[PDB]
Amino acid sequence: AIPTNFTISVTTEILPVSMTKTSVDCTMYICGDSTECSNLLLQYGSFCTQ
Amino acid sequence: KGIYQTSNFRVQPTESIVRFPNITNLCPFGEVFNATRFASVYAWNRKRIS
Numbered sequence: 001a002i003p004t005n006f007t008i009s010v011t012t013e014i015l016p017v018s019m020t021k022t023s024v025d026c027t028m029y030i031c032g033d034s035t036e037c038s039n040l041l042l043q044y045g046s047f048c049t050q
Numbered sequence: 051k052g053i054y055q056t057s058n059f060r061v062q063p064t065e066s067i068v069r070f071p072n073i074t075n076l077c078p079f080g081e082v083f084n085a086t087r088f089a090s091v092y093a094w095n096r097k098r099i100s
């Protein structure tokens with residue numbers, strides 16, 4: 001079976017390229033605005049540096 | 051060299067605010083601690099304080 005005609009088909013495909021960049025502040029997330037809590041968070045500072 | 055997100059250290063508090071109800075009535079400490087007669091344990095007395 002040999003074709004005797006043709007069609008020019010345009011297909012659309014979508015690909016995600018990136019996602020929303022995000023940043024997090026340990027101090028104001030965990031220890032919202034209290035100094036007493038933020039002092040206790042210093043010993044865990046390494047974790048946030050991760 | 052680059053751009054760095056930073057946590058919160060620049061803000062520090064310096065003043066304090068207190069806001070209680072304005073009441074001048076001393077509370078009946080003499081009517082519960084200095085009461086002439088106390089109740090039996092089985093029929094224990096209950097007093098509202100407001």
Ligand SMILES: *[C@@H]1O[C@H](CO)[C@@H](O)[C@H](O)[C@H]1NC(C)=O
Nearest residue numbers: 078079080081082083084085
């Ligand atoms: C309780 O009673 C004693 C003597 O009856 C009196 O010295 C004292 O001031 C009274 N305390 C209060 C809080 O009323």
